[PDB]
Amino acid sequence: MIQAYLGLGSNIGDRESQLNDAIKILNEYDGISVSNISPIYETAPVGYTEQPNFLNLCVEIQTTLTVLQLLECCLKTEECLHRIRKERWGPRTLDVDILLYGEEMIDLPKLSVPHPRMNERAFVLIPLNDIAANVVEPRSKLKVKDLVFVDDSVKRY
Numbered sequence: 001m002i003q004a005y006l007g008l009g010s011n012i013g014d015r016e017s018q019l020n021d022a023i024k025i026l027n028e029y030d031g032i033s034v035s036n037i038s039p040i041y042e043t044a045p046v047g048y049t050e051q052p053n054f055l056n057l058c059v060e061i062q063t064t065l066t067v068l069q070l071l072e073c074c075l076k077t078e079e080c081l082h083r084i085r086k087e088r089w090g091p092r093t094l095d096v097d098i099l100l101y102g103e104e105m106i107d108l109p110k111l112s113v114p115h116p117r118m119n120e121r122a123f124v125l126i127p128l129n130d131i132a133a134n135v136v137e138p139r140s141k142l143k144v145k146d147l148v149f150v151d152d153s154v155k156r157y
């Protein structure tokens with residue numbers, strides 16, 4: 001059994017209902033057991049143009065899946081939630097990102113763990129710190145509580 005952390009996001013549709021449904025679906029896969037869920041935060045979009053605000057959270061799982069098996073479950077969950085994939089990025093019903101998989105470092109064309117952008121994302125680190133403050137991010141070798149930073153664009157929902 002591996003302790004892993006997922007980052008979830010939604011910025012279109014009924015954001016909160018979609019996040020809750022996603023967690024339930026994730027938990028229903030054999031080999032994934034949801035053990036903790038952060039508070040939900042409303043967050044300003046980063047890395048693109050002006051877009052509707054996100055609801056973001058983090059989830060702790062105990063898994064017996066390999067990290068690629070896990071990734072398949074994450075992407076299937078997005079499909080259950082009807083996520084649209086057009087030529088250009090836009091708002092999405094659900095995004096399920098693998099943040100951390102134990103202390104492992106994976107670099108494959110289809111999978112990068114720890115997530116390559118997490119250490120500079122408040123919408124990740126603030127909810128992650130609520131459930132994983134003492135977990136080590138293996139690239140930096142820092143605990144989450146030593147990466148997190150204050151960011152007024154991330155608010156409790």
Ligand SMILES: Nc1ncnc2c1ncn2[C@@H]1O[C@H](COP(=O)(O)CP(=O)(O)OP(=O)(O)O)[C@@H](O)[C@H]1O
Nearest residue numbers: 071074095096097098099110111112113114115117
């Ligand atoms: N840690 C990770 N978690 C989830 N998908 C990952 C991943 N590392 C790589 N991927 C790949 O990323 C592909 C595109 O996923 P998307 O969800 O569209 C990116 P995004 O989550 O919108 O952007 P972001 O990575 O900047 O958060 C997936 O099909 C998967 O193969």
Ligand SMILES: Nc1nc2nc(SCc3ccc(F)cc3)[nH]c2c(=O)[nH]1
Nearest residue numbers: 009043044045046048051090091123
């Ligand atoms: N707050 C926040 N910003 C995030 N930026 C990304 S990737 C660029 C992007 C893609 C589509 C979109 F509509 C807005 C921004 N994912 C995010 C997330 O989950 N939360």
Ligand SMILES: [Cl-]
Nearest residue numbers: 083084092093
């Ligand atoms: Cl969508």
Ligand SMILES: [Mg+2]
Nearest residue numbers: 095096097098
């Ligand atoms: Mg994603």
Ligand SMILES: [Mg+2]
Nearest residue numbers: 009095096097
């Ligand atoms: Mg993402």
Ligand code: NA
Nearest residue numbers: 027028029032
């Ligand atoms: Na399960």
Ligand code: NA
Nearest residue numbers: 107108109112
């Ligand atoms: Na790579």
